[PDB]
Amino acid sequence: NMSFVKETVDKLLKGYDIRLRPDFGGPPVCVGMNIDIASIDMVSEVNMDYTLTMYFQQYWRDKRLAYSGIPLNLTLDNRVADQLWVPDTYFLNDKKSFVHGVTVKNRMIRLHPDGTVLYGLRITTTAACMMDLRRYPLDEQNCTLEIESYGYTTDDIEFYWRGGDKAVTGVERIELPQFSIVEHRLVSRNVVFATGAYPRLSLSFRLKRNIGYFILQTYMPSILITILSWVSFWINYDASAARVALGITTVLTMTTINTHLRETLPKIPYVKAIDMYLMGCFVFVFLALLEYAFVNYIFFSYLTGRAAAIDRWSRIVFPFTFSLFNLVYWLYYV
Amino acid sequence: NMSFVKETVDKLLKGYDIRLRPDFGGPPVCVGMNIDIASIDMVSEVNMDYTLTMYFQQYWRDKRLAYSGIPLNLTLDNRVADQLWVPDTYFLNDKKSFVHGVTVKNRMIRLHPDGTVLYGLRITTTAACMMDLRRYPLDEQNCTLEIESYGYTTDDIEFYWRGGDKAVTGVERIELPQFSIVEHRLVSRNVVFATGAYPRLSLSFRLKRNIGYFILQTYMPSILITILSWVSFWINYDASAARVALGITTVLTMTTINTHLRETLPKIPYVKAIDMYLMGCFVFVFLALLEYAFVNYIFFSKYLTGRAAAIDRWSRIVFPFTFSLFNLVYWLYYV
Amino acid sequence: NMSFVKETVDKLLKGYDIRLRPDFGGPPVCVGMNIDIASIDMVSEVNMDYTLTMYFQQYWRDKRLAYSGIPLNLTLDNRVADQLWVPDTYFLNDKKSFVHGVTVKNRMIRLHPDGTVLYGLRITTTAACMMDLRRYPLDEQNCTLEIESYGYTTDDIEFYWRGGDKAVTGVERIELPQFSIVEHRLVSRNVVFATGAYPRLSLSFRLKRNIGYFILQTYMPSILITILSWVSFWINYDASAARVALGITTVLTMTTINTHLRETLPKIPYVKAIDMYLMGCFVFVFLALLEYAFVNYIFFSRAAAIDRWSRIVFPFTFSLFNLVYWLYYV
Amino acid sequence: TTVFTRILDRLLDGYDNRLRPGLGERVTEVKTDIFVTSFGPVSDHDMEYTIDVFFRQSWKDERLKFKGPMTVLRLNNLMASKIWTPDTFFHNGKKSVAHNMTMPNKLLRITEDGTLLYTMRLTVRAECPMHLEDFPMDAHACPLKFGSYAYTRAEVVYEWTREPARSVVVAEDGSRLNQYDLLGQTVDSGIVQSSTGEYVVMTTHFHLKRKIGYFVIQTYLPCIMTVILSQVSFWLNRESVPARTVFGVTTVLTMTTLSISARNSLPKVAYATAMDWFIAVCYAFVFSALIEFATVNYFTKSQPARAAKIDRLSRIAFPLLFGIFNLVYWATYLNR
Amino acid sequence: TTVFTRILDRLLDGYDNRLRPGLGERVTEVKTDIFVTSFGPVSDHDMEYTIDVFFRQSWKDERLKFKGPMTVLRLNNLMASKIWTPDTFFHNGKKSVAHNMTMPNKLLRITEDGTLLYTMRLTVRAECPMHLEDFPMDAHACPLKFGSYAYTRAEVVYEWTREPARSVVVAEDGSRLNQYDLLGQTVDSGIVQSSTGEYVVMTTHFHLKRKIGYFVIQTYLPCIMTVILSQVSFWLNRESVPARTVFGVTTVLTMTTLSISARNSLPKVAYATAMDWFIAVCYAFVFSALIEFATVNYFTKSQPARAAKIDRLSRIAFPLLFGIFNLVYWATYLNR
Amino acid sequence: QVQLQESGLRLSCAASGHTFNYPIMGWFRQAPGKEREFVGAISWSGGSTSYADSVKDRFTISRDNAKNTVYLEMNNLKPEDTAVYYCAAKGRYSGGLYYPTNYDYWGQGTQVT
Ligand SMILES: *[C@@H]1O[C@H](CO)[C@@H](O[C@@H]2O[C@H](CO)[C@@H](O[C@@H]3O[C@H](CO[C@H]4O[C@H](CO)[C@@H](O)[C@H](O)[C@@H]4O)[C@@H](O)[C@H](O[C@H]4O[C@H](CO)[C@@H](O)[C@H](O)[C@@H]4O)[C@@H]3O)[C@H](O)[C@H]2NC(C)=O)[C@H](O)[C@H]1NC(C)=O
Ligand SMILES: *[C@@H]1O[C@H](CO)[C@@H](O[C@@H]2O[C@H](CO)[C@@H](O[C@@H]3O[C@H](CO[C@H]4O[C@H](CO)[C@@H](O)[C@H](O)[C@@H]4O)[C@@H](O)[C@H](O[C@H]4O[C@H](CO)[C@@H](O)[C@H](O)[C@@H]4O)[C@@H]3O)[C@H](O)[C@H]2NC(C)=O)[C@H](O)[C@H]1NC(C)=O
Ligand SMILES: *[C@@H]1O[C@H](CO)[C@@H](O[C@@H]2O[C@H](CO)[C@@H](O[C@@H]3O[C@H](CO[C@H]4O[C@H](CO)[C@@H](O)[C@H](O)[C@@H]4O)[C@@H](O)[C@H](O[C@H]4O[C@H](CO)[C@@H](O)[C@H](O)[C@@H]4O)[C@@H]3O)[C@H](O)[C@H]2NC(C)=O)[C@H](O)[C@H]1NC(C)=O
Ligand SMILES: *[C@@H]1O[C@H](CO)[C@@H](O[C@@H]2O[C@H](CO)[C@@H](O)[C@H](O)[C@H]2NC(C)=O)[C@H](O)[C@H]1NC(C)=O
Ligand SMILES: *[C@@H]1O[C@H](CO)[C@@H](O)[C@H](O)[C@H]1NC(C)=O
Ligand SMILES: *[C@@H]1O[C@H](CO)[C@@H](O)[C@H](O)[C@H]1NC(C)=O
Ligand SMILES: *[C@@H]1O[C@H](CO)[C@@H](O)[C@H](O)[C@H]1NC(C)=O
Ligand SMILES: NCCc1c[nH]cn1
């Protein structure tokens, strides 16, 4: 019968003060959170934030909304969320967030017979993710989503992850382009501001960056350019135009790729750990030009023997030194 | 009197059912329309759209709102539109649009004693304009704004341009940077959907793209670099390094300008008119380099120098003629 | 003491018809406007507009809201603006405007015992002013903010700059990064439309682009690179590799500047002073390589002459071009 | 005149929009339909694609049964606020807007049998997975899934209005695809289990094919020209050492710039797709040309007889090797 | 159970929220405090900086006196709309959004003595002037000013909740500053004069210091590399005209390229910065080094003793000149 | 300020001053009894023109920027067109083109008969 449910639902909303939380004078109400992630796309370094889409569900108990005689579990329209009291959770890391509104404000209200209330939302959030780029692109980032109660202190409300470690789901099905979710954790804590102590749940992700795209874009061309400088060593000693053009254009290409690759990432006041490789390669090319200039100076300012000896020494030393530097760099970072 | 108008207005709205259109059971209501274009601000080739701001006036007859006694117009406060029936007209081409709301929601309601209502809005729309860039930038383009009723079929509402061809005004107020409006057009027709027929008006604009900037920016660097390549002909074949550097740097410059200018336009598969010209100039400089290499191979690999000089003068007299022929053909084909 | 004001305000608003303007049958209501320009933000040539922030106040006289026995003129909460009639003022140059809503919809309503009502807002607009770039970057600009009544004709409503010439304030405190506000002008007029005559207010700023950045960072590279091309003359003609390398790489640098400076200002059809200077520099570097080619052709077909004549011709011709350019545009 | 007002008042007497039809009697069968006015651009950078649809939903509500002069009442959107409607939402949506220009773009029609028709104009910006392994010559199947948010399968069950093949319809004029071609669509329905319960999810995949002309003209032609420059660098006399040096130099520089320019267009995928392989092979070609030039220059004086043989071998080998590489590459990738 | 409902109803017994407390009696005192949760990025391009704060306000209201079992009752955000609150606004804000996720991020607390506390989470994008004359070795004092909008000094007067230095406190973890260091802060209050009347405004100045570690490896190192390239251009012999020519011209090209690149990623301004000075001096050095070769090659044919003399003098002088210029520049800027 | 001079079947209206600030230029006519009426108008670019109903496809308006001039050409003249003609300039935002009040500056009346 629809009229029975009609009058039951009408009676439930008589004398129901939305201003007062459930059990206003009694012990704090326990709210159980649950999360189902859809995507973590757009992990931006320039913006220092990540976009997260999430089904966020909250379970609690409200004696005022208990009903009997209706065995089924009332799935009410989302508009009923305006009448009922709902928790006041809020994300600390968020910059811009919204609840989806495609054809309806995407919310769900479910009333169980025992007064238990389930409140579900579909939220998109742009949460700040501070990053330590001192090992970029060989870094492993840690950043989180914090969930806090705004108005109600710990003595008026308490949070807990419903289902323990199974509260958050969908982490396995997430495939970022240039990242891999290694591990994730759930933590519950109390934060003591000036006003008082509030609960805080937190879901933390540790992301690991891929390497293939970065190495293929950045590191390999520097290697080829250094090998061109070594070709400049090998080619001759007296052919001034060929060697000098090759070296100066080697420097030109190195600074060209440096300028093109310097604009991808944001401003940070330290070596980015990919800049170190570019500076090393630039320094190697620079020393190639320096030793070429030294060869011309000693030759033009017996002498042919010195020039040949220095050329052999350079061509046998520089590749070995570059290999040593490369191994030291890779072992240090990777 | 003051209270007389107040009680008359209160009597008008009393018993007024906004859910039902005027003449609910009777024949369809006619809705004349006027558009006054403030400006067409953006025309984006990356986004395939254009921004358009306009005063949009609708005019219809509602016998329920007829009043007597008061002999002058009623220019009511525009909040009254919240409690009145208005046609539900939408622009089928819009992507993002909004009614301007600076200091008040920019609307106006004017009721006349015979019951005719005039409803004015100040709308801005980012309308979609699909466009063919085959002849870009020598292209004569078309854009449209496409008005239609959503809820009501042709059996319940009629659209017409109030004032005929003079319905749309303010065309002279449009001053785009590069485009020039050749001539506009107004069309009215019934479109058939699955649910049923619907009235549908269409404003159309034919834009012509100015060319002088395209010339001065993109084109004449290409001709300039082509003649840079040609300068290698008037150099002694013995100085191989000079001709090599000249030709190879001209090719490098062609690559640089091509890759620095390609990104401006969207990813269009078919080759644009400008891309044909850039490829032609690339081919010309490439052939200059190749024929120099051919001369060098013939010579190095009395009599031979004569052949080299013959080839050099042949190239000197042939390359300008062939390039002029290609340029004239290209310009005449696209103009 | 407190409930007295409550009942007075309740009495004022009950029976108040927001729909009907004050003096519906009487003469038009005079709305005295006033502006305080907080700051003129960025002025994008690309967007062909400028962002403005302004405290926008307007006074009028509603006899319906007259009260007595309360000498203190009331500063009511902004929510009461929903219950009162206000003018349908709007802007014509705006493309996207909004009233700030930081902790409250930023509005103020101040009633006075005589019946005068002051209505204030804090508005931020993106007003479009078309710019003439023929003289760019040595050009003047006129950018205007225009105010109209959307619905009410001049028979119903009337505007006037309250305080006369002193209506708009705060312009002197503004310091734009490049432009300089040389003067501002207030105008009041009556614009005739098809529907009828409407009242118009206008605040027009004259902007002069300060020239100390483009002159140093744009023209100087091209000038120095043309002098660089001229350096090739002093090198002997026998060093063909040096001459062709210098000329061709000067051309390469010039086109690099040309293709990297396109991010300065948007697509426009007509020629610009900056474009004229760039094109002059481009042709002047080109004629160096052209006359060098003539030198080689004449020599290998007397030539030191070609060069000697060129050494004085090219700087003189470029100086003449520079003087003509500066005289024409200044 | 005013009889319809009385009918509407009677319909909304004792009517609650919070309770679905048949709340304890039967499952609500919500027939649905989509008409795609315009298939928006597919942004590979943002992993997304836009679409504009007339989303239609029809269901029977016995509460809204009336007998009146007219068979069908074509009410405005205002009634939709005061009436029960399904909770449909798009599972893979990112940021969608329901257009409300002038008035809310919603059509509501009520039939004398209680049947309802609720149509609305949506602009859905959905997320599409992109297996870019065969980039830029890769087909795709971008999905669009929708279903109820709150009601499980036991409460609300969706269906296609007409036959599923004819259900989703795409307007012919509204393409709005710059570099993609739509190869038809395939629809289906299924049940998705979740934490709350089983839900009916209706999916439609749009098949897309990349258009290659822009990419070939932008990337492969410049790369082919640069490697051809490296090829013709061989043919000059050996003694012109600066000449061949500057060919190798400038060819490598141009190739690096073109590689960067081609690379900026792709997304941040961590695998060489097909342009990376082409660019790597063209690197190998130009560096091989420069290296063997250095070799013959080294041997130009000690043993000036093997240099001619090496040059002849290079001329016969490098162009043929590049040609067969191009043939096998194009045959392998185009046929897929 | 229902005692608090009737208490709340009795509180709003003809309570007019449009009237300030003590409207005809005295000036209401609004003690306020700020807790900066985060200091967002400072966008010099957009001439603004972002901050995320818990803006707190506290004022005594006699009309909201009550007597109940619990001394202090904490209410939701709906009561906030139903009572008078101050109209505090930021004078220099550009586009600030009050967060509204889940439900409006605010809180209201009422005490038996009529004391009332009202806090809200805010994100303020405030504009602050910047003098880039000493860029990038430039400090800034970006202000954040706020005060009432409608009510004047006589109608409302604000105050700091505690001692002013301790009133505004910044969260340690929430820095969100990459190229700046928050070198403390200060607060103050003052009476701004306006046409409507004198208002009370409080400012807090955040002292920022730009970090040079990025800009040094951005610009100042490649410039020095090009200058040393010119020096090794000097070190070469005189016979090889094309070697020194290509050094000079390519160094000019690289200098121009990096000079435009550094200028591009900066806000437009009508005066020369320190980086502009450095770039100009480096360009001057490069051009000087090339014209020195122009002179040397001109004079090498006739009387090469002068050519050798000027070459030796230039080799001795140019590195010394560059070194002393660099020392003067760094001593001028880094010392302050 | 914009100065306009009339010359003159064919008529010419020159322009000098801040012609950019006053794009639209219009032609009006007046008989000794009949009041001023809108004959035609042309924009700054000149691509868009408007004419009154009574002077459709008989009059013509052209714009040349050689010295900031516009030209009005009459064809199929009739005795009812004998009148004095004015050339005026309109501001950027001044409303409709058909009303003399919007136009700011006016050229000296040129008689035609
Ligand atoms: C990414 O990086 C972030 C860093 O920002 C990590 O965040 C920390 O995560 C760890 C583990 O997940 C947290 O450790 C836990 O804190 C809980 C909070 O309890 C408070 O409890 C009492 C209150 O009086 C005090 O002890 C103290 O004030 C605590 O702050 C603890 O209850 C937890 O204790 C449990 O773990 C310990 C250690 O294993 C056991 O000995 C205990 O018996 C008990 O089982 C625990 O200590 C830490 O608080 C988080 N810090 C912050 C700042 O949030 C992410 O975890 C990390 N994630 C990934 C995937 O990399
Ligand atoms: C930019 O590009 C668009 C797209 O091509 C152009 O839009 C087309 O514009 C033309 C006008 O130039 C439109 O032509 C009009 O259609 C009318 C029909 O409306 C009806 O539909 C059916 C017709 O069977 C009937 O129910 C009823 O008549 C409706 O009115 C025609 O009446 C118009 O005129 C023709 O017929 C009469 C009588 O036979 C002839 O005397 C006329 O000369 C003419 O042949 C006209 O054909 C066309 O409909 C538009 N396309 C669409 C899809 O609607 C824009 O015009 C273009 N921009 C510019 C500035 O030209
Ligand atoms: C930047 O660019 C803008 C836009 O072009 C310029 O604005 C123009 O500014 C001038 C100067 O203020 C305006 O000129 C005037 O029109 C006013 C209104 O005019 C009519 O309406 C009134 C009232 O109904 C009638 O009485 C009158 O007869 C007209 O029908 C006049 O009131 C002004 O009068 C002043 O000048 C006259 C003549 O010298 C004097 O006799 C008066 O006493 C008074 O001093 C004036 O005629 C013009 O309208 C503006 N253009 C518009 C609105 O399109 C800016 O001036 C320019 N410069 C700057 C710095 O911004
Ligand atoms: C209320 O506001 C009015 C403003 O209209 C105040 O009126 C004036 O008093 C000031 C100060 O003496 C003068 O500068 C103005 O010229 C006066 N204007 C008038 C009388 O129209 C009035 O003082 C205010 N009253 C209170 C109690 O604040
Ligand atoms: C109502 O919800 C509870 C939650 O677990 C479930 O166990 C129960 O079966 C539901 N009722 C019905 C009738 O399905
Ligand atoms: C936006 O849509 C809502 C839908 O409820 C509507 O009320 C509002 O008027 C729309 N905004 C406009 C027309 O500016
Ligand atoms: C969100 O903010 C709006 C203000 O636009 C407010 O009306 C609403 O109550 C807030 N909460 C929700 C759940 O919408
Ligand atoms: N505010 C004037 C709107 C208008 C346009 N056209 C006629 N009236």
Numbering used by the authors:
A (entry chain E): 8 to 308, 415 to 447
B (entry chain B): 8 to 308, 414 to 447
C (entry chain C): 8 to 308, 419 to 447
D (entry chain A): 12 to 209, 578 to 715
E (entry chain D): 12 to 347
F (entry chain F): 1 to 8, 405 to 509
Paper's wording?
Type A GABA (GABAA) receptors belong to the pentameric ligand-gated ion channel (pLGIC) superfamily, which includes mammalian nicotinic acetylcholine receptors (nAChRs), serotonin type 3A receptors and glycine receptors, as well as other non-mammalian homologues. Here we solve structures of extrasynaptic GABAA receptors to explain the molecular mechanisms underlying a low Po and marked inhibition by Zn2+. In all the structures, the single β–β interface is occupied by megabody 25 (Mb25), which comprises the immunogenic binding domain nanobody 25 (Nb25) fused to a cHopQ enlargement domain, which is required to randomize particle orientation and break the quasi-five-fold symmetry for particle alignment. The co-ligand histamine, included to boost yield, also occupies this β–β interface in all the structures, binding deeper inside the crevice in a pocket homologous to the two orthosteric β–α GABA binding sites, as previously described.
In the absence of Zn2+, the GABA signalling response initially follows the canonical route until it reaches the pore. GABA binding at the two β–α sites induces realignment of the corresponding β-subunit ECDs (chains B and E) and clockwise translation of the β1–β2 and β6–β7 base loops above the transmembrane domain (TMD). By contrast, the GABA structure shows that in the absence of Zn2+, the β3 17′ His side chain density is absent because these polar residues orient randomly and the pore diameter at this location expands (>4.1 Å) to permit the passage of chloride ions (Pauling radius of 1.8 Å). With all the M2–M3 loops in the outward position, each of the five channel-lining M2 helices, one contributed by each subunit around the pore, tilt and laterally translate outwards. As a result, the 9′ leucine ring, situated midway along the pore and forming a hydrophobic gate in the α-CBTx–Zn2+ inhibited state, retracts to increase the pore diameter from 2 Å to 3.1 Å, and the 9′ Cα perimeter increases from 40.2 Å to 44.2 Å. Despite this shift, the pore remains too narrow to permit the passage of chloride anions (Pauling radius of 1.8 Å) and this gate remains closed. In contrast to synaptic GABAA receptors, expansion of the midway pore activation gate is limited and it remains closed, reflecting the intrinsic low efficacy that characterizes the extrasynaptic receptor. Thus, replacing γ2 with the more upright β3 M2 helix has the consequent effect of limiting the outward tilt and expansion of the other subunits, thereby limiting 9′ gate expansion. Despite the ECDs and M2–M3 loops responding to GABA, a more upright β-subunit M2 helix occupying the γ-subunit position results in the 9′ Leu pore gate remaining mostly closed. This provides a molecular explanation for the comparatively low Po of α1β3 receptors compared with synaptic α1β3γ2 receptors, a feature required to prevent excessive inhibition of neuronal circuitry by αβ and αβδ extrasynaptic subtypes.
